[PDB]
Amino acid sequence: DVHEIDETLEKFLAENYTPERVQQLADRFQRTGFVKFDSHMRIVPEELITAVRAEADRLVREHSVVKSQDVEQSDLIRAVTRSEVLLTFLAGITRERIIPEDERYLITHQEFASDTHGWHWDDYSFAFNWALRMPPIASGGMVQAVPHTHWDKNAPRINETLCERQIDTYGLVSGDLYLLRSDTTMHRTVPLTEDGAVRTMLVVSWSAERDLGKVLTGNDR
Amino acid sequence: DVHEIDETLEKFLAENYTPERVQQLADRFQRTGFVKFDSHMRIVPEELITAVRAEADRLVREHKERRDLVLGLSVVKSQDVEQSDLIRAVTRSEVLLTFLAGITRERIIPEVSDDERYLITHQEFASGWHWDDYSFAFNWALRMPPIASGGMVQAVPHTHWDKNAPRINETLCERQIDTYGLVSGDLYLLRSDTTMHRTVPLTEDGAVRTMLVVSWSAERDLGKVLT
Amino acid sequence: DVHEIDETLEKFLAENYTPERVQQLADRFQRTGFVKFDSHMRIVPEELITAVRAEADRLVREHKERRDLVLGLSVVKSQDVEQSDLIRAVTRSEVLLTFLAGITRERIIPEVSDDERYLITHQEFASGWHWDDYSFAFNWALRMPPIASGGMVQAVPHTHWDKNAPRINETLCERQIDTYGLVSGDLYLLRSDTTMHRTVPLTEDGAVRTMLVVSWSAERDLGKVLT
Amino acid sequence: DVHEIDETLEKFLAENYTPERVQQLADRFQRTGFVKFDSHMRIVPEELITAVRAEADRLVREHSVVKSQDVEQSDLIRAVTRSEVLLTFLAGITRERIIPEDERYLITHQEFASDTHGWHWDDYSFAFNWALRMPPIASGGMVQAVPHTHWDKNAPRINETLCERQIDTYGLVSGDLYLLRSDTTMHRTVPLTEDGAVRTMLVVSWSAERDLGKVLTGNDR
Numbered sequence: 001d002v003h004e005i006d007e008t009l010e011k012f013l014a015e016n017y018t019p020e021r022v023q024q025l026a027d028r029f030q031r032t033g034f035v036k037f038d039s040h041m042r043i044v045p046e047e048l049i050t051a052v053r054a055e056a057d058r059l060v061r062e063h064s065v066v067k068s069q070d071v072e073q074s075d076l077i078r079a080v081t082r083s084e085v086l087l088t089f090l091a092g093i094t095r096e097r098i099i100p101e102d103e104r105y106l107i108t109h110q111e112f113a114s115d116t117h118g119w120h121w122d123d124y125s126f127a128f129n130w131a132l133r134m135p136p137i138a139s140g141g142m143v144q145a146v147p148h149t150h151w152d153k154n155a156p157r158i159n160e161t162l163c164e165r166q167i168d169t170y171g172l173v174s175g176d177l178y179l180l181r182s183d184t185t186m187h188r189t190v191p192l193t194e195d196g197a198v199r200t201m202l203v204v205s206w207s208a209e210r211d212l213g214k215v216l217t218g219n220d221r
Numbered sequence: 222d223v224h225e226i227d228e229t230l231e232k233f234l235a236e237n238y239t240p241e242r243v244q245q246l247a248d249r250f251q252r253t254g255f256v257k258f259d260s261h262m263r264i265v266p267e268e269l270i271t272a273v274r275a276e277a278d279r280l281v282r283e284h285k286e287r288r289d290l291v292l293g294l295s296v297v298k299s300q301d302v303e304q305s306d307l308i309r310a311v312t313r314s315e316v317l318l319t320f321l322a323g324i325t326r327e328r329i330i331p332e333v334s335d336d337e338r339y340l341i342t343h344q345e346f347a348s349g350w351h352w353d354d355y356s357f358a359f360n361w362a363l364r365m366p367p368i369a370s371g372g373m374v375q376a377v378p379h380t381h382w383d384k385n386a387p388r389i390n391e392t393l394c395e396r397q398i399d400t401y402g403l404v405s406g407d408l409y410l411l412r413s414d415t416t417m418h419r420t421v422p423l424t425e426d427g428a429v430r431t432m433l434v435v436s437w438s439a440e441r442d443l444g445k446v447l448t
Numbered sequence: 449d450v451h452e453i454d455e456t457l458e459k460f461l462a463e464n465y466t467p468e469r470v471q472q473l474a475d476r477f478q479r480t481g482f483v484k485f486d487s488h489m490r491i492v493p494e495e496l497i498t499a500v501r502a503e504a505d506r507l508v509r510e511h512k513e514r515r516d517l518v519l520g521l522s523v524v525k526s527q528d529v530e531q532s533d534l535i536r537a538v539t540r541s542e543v544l545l546t547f548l549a550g551i552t553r554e555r556i557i558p559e560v561s562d563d564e565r566y567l568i569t570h571q572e573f574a575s576g577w578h579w580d581d582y583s584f585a586f587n588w589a590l591r592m593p594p595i596a597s598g599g600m601v602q603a604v605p606h607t608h609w610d611k612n613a614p615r616i617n618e619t620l621c622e623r624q625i626d627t628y629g630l631v632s633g634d635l636y637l638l639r640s641d642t643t644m645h646r647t648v649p650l651t652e653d654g655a656v657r658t659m660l661v662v663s664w665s666a667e668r669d670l671g672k673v674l675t
Numbered sequence: 676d677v678h679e680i681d682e683t684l685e686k687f688l689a690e691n692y693t694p695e696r697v698q699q700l701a702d703r704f705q706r707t708g709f710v711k712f713d714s715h716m717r718i719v720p721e722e723l724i725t726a727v728r729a730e731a732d733r734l735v736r737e738h739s740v741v742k743s744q745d746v747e748q749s750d751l752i753r754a755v756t757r758s759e760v761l762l763t764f765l766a767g768i769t770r771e772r773i774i775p776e777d778e779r780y781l782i783t784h785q786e787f788a789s790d791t792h793g794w795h796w797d798d799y800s801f802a803f804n805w806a807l808r809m810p811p812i813a814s815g816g817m818v819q820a821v822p823h824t825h826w827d828k829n830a831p832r833i834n835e836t837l838c839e840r841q842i843d844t845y846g847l848v849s850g851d852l853y854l855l856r857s858d859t860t861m862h863r864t865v866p867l868t869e870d871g872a873v874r875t876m877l878v879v880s881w882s883a884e885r886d887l888g889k890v891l892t893g894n895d896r
Contacts, residue, residue, distance in 0.1 A: 023825055030859065031823035092896075095885070137390045148706035150698055159368045159402070159421070166397035171390070184705065190390070210770070221767075244608050251642065252606035326668075379479035381471050415478065441553075595834045617812045617846070617865070624841035629834070648834070 033147035033185030254378035254416030366428030481605035481643030593655030708822035708860030810872035
C-alpha cells in the first residue's frame with residue numbers, strides 16, 4: 001500500500017472537496033484556530049486511519065508518551081504526515097505554505113482519571129492531530145482552545161488570558177482529525193473523569209514561514 | 222448599626238447609580254448570567270464589606286474550633302451563618318434586594334429551603350460544574366487568591382439542568398465558557414438556574430479563598446415547587 | 449376545519465418534538481431572542497402554512513382594492529386581519545400558545561392593545577431599528593424574496609428601549625448584530641422588547657415580501673401598563 | 676516640519692507603547708480584523724493629525740471622492756503614510772511585513788443623507804484609515820466589519836455571509852485612526868442619517884507578502 005498513498009489521497013480529496021468548501025474551512029480556521037475533520041468532513045480515508053491507529057497502538061506498547069524519534073520509525077506515519085498531496089491541500093485551509101520541518105511527532109496516551117495535557121501554546125504554527133482513540137464525551141478528553149492569543153514566555157498569564165477571552169470546547173470521536181493554529185491558540189485537553197478512559201493522540205507539528213523567520217532572527221519578528 | 226444599615230446602603234446606591242447604569246447592568250445580567258460588583262462598580266460600601274469579612278472570618282474560626290472540639294475546605298452551614306446579625310441584615314436588606322431586582326428585572330424572593338439560604342466556604346488547600354435549584358446566587362468573594370492561583374468563576378449562560386441527563390461535557394462542546402477573575406471584596410450576582418457554573422480549582426496550597434454565598438428565589442422557583 | 453385545527457397542531461407537535469428539543473429551543477430563545485421555525489424545525493404543518501398564506505394574500509388584495517376604491521408597502525390593520533377566522537384560529541390556538549410557552553419559559557398572554565394584535569405587511573418595491581412594547585412577536589414569513597434581495601431579520605438581543613434616548617447607533621457600537629435569513633413559509637418567535645430588531649431593506653423592485661405579525665404579552669407587560 | 680516626522684513618531688511611539696501593549700493589539704487585530712487608535716490609544720501625535728486634516732480639506736475643495744494620484748500630490752500625507760517608523764511599528768500589530776506598494780490613497784467625503792460605502796472587501800491586505808472628520812454617532816458613519824471572511828469574486832454572497840456571521844460596529848470620532856485587515860474583513864460604512872453630516876476619510880492601502888504572491892501567480896495561492 002506504500003507509495004500509492006499520494007494517489008489515494010489525491011483522488012479522495014478531489015472527489016470530496018470543492019475549492020469553495022476549502023475556502024469556508026479557511027475562514028473557520030482563521031476565525032477559530034481549529035478545523036475538525038470528523039465523519040462529516042473526512043480528509044483521510046477510513047482505511048488509512050485504521051492503519052495509522054494500528055501503527056500507533058503498536059508504538060504505544062513500547063512507550064504514557066511516545067517520543068518523536070520513536071514515532072518516526074513508522075514508515076506509514078511518515079508517508080502520510082509528509083504527503084505532498086495532504087500538505088498542499090491543507091495549505092488551502094491555512095492560506096500559507098506549510099513546512100513539514102526537532103520534535104516532529106508525538107503520541108500521547110491517557111488512561112487514568114485526571115489525565116490532562118494542561119494549558120499551553122506551541123512554538124510552531126500548526127498542529128495536525130489524529131484522535132485515534134477517544135473515550136465518550138462524558139469521560140472527558142475534549143480539546144479546549146482560546147484563539148487569537150500569544151505565548152509571553154516571561155509571563156504567560158494563562159488564567160488572566162482566560163478572564164479576557166472565551167473558551168471553545170471541541171468533542172472528538174475515535175478517528176477524528178483536526179488542524180490547530182498552535183502558536184496563537186492556547187489549548188489543553190479536558191482532564192479524564194474515569195479510569196480506563198483510553199485517549200490516544202498522534203500529534204504532528206509543522207512550521208510556517210513565520211517559524212523559519214523566528215529561527216533566522218532568533219526573535220519574534 | 223441596625224436600621225442604619227439600610228440608610229447607609231440607600232444613600233450609597235443613590236449616590237453611585239443612574240437609571241442608565243442599572244439598565245446597562247440588567248442588559249449584562251440577561252446576556253451573561255453574571256454581574257460583578259468590583260472596585261469600579263461597588264454596590265455595598267467598602268466599610269461594610271470589611272465588616273462582613275470580619276464576621277465571616279469569625280464564623281469560620283468558630284466553626285473550625287467547634288468541629289475540632291467534637292471530631293478531633295471548611296463549610297459553615299446556613300443555620301450557623303444565619304446567627305450573624307450583620308450578615309443577616311445586609312443580605313436581607315429591603316434596600317439591597319429592591320436595587321438588585323432592577324438588574325434581575327423581576328422580583329427577588331429572599332426565601333429558599335432553610336438549609337440553603339446561606340453558606341460560607343473557606344478553602345486553604347488545593348482541591349465542579351453545576352446548576353442550582355434557585356434562580357439567583359449573590360456571592361461575596363470576601364477573600365480571593367491571586368488569579369494565577371485559580372479560584373476564578375466560570376459560567377456558561379443560557380443552559381438548563383436536565384436532572385436525568387445533565388450532559389455537562391456535551392454542553393461545553395456546544396457553548397463557550399466565560400471566566401471571571403475576582404479579587405477580595407468583589408461581589409457578584411449570578412443567574413444560577415440557567416448558567417452552568419463552577420469555581421476554578423485552586424492549584425497551590427496556601428492560597429486562601431473565603432466566599433459568602435446567598436441563595437434567592439424568583440417567582441419561577443416558587444411555581445416549580447408547587448408543580 | 450374548526451376545532452380540527454387544535455387537534456392537527458397537537459398531533460403535529462407531539463409527533464415532532466421531544467422535551468429535549470423544546471429545552472434546546474428555550475436555551476436558544478433566552479440566548480439570542482430569536483427562534484426560527486424553518487423546514488428543519490416546523491411548528492405548524494406545511495398544509496396550514498399554505499392556507500394561512502392564501503388568507504393573507506386574500507386580505508392584502510382585498511385591502512388594496514378597498515383602498516383604491518376610496519383613495520384612487522401595503523399594511524393590513526389589526527381589525528381587518530382579525531376578521532379571518534383561519535388566521536384568528538391558528539394564532540390564538542391554545543395548543544400553539546401552550547407549546548411556545550415552553551420556549552419562552554413563561555406564560556404567553558395573547559392580549560395586546562387591540563390596534564396591534566395582528567398585522568400583515570406586503571412589500572413590492574425597494575424601500576428600521578426598533579423595539580416593541582410587548583415581550584413577544586410571532587411572525588409568519590409567508591412570502592420572502594431571495595436572501596440576495598434583502599429582507600433578512602437582524603437582531604441585537606439583551607438591549608432595552610430607553611424612550612427618552614433610544615441610542616440605536618450607540619447600542620450597535622457596543623454589541624454584535626445577528627442576521628437571520630428567511631424563506632417563504634418560515635415562522636419565527638422574537639423577544640421583541642429586549643431584542644433591538646429590524647427588517648433588512650429590500651434592494652430590488654419586484655422582490656415580494658409578505659409578513660403576518662402577531663404580538664403577544666408576557667406578565668411583565670401587564671404589570672408595566674398597571675404601573 | 677518635514678523630514679523630522681520620523682524622529683517625531685519614533686519618540687511618540689517609544690514613549691507610549693511597550694512591546695507587550697503592541698502584542699495585545701496584535702491579538703485584537705487577528706481576532707477582529709480591526710484596531711482603533713482613538714484618544715486613549717494614539718498612534719500619531721495630535722499636531723500631525725490636524726495637519727493631515729488641513730491637507731485633506733484642501734484636496735477636498737478640488738474633489739465627493741479624491742482619487743489617488745491627486746492625494747499623492749500632498750507631501751505631508753506621503754511622508755506620514757510611508758514613514759518607515761510607522762510601518763515598522765504597525766508590523767508589530769499585523770505580525771508580518773507591511774509593503775507600502777496602484778490605488779494607494781483615497782479621500783472619501785460624505786455629507787448627504789443615505790451616504791454610504793457599501794459592503795465590500797478589498798484586494799489588498801491592509802487599510803490604514805484616518806477618520807479626520809466624523810459626525811455624531813447618531814448621524815451614522817460608523818464602520819461595520821465582518822472578519823474571517825473572503826471575497827469570492829464569482830459569487831460574493833454578501834447577504835448570505837451576514838447570515839452566517841455577526842457584525843461588529845465601530846464608532847469613530849474626528850481624529851481617530853484605524854487599521855483594518857481589508858481582504859478578509861467584509862466592511863462598509865453606516866449610511867448617514869442627516870444631511871449636513873460631514874464625514875471625511877483618508878484611506879491608505881498597503882500590501883502584505885500574500886498580495887505580492889497573488890500578483891506573481893495571478894492566483895489566490
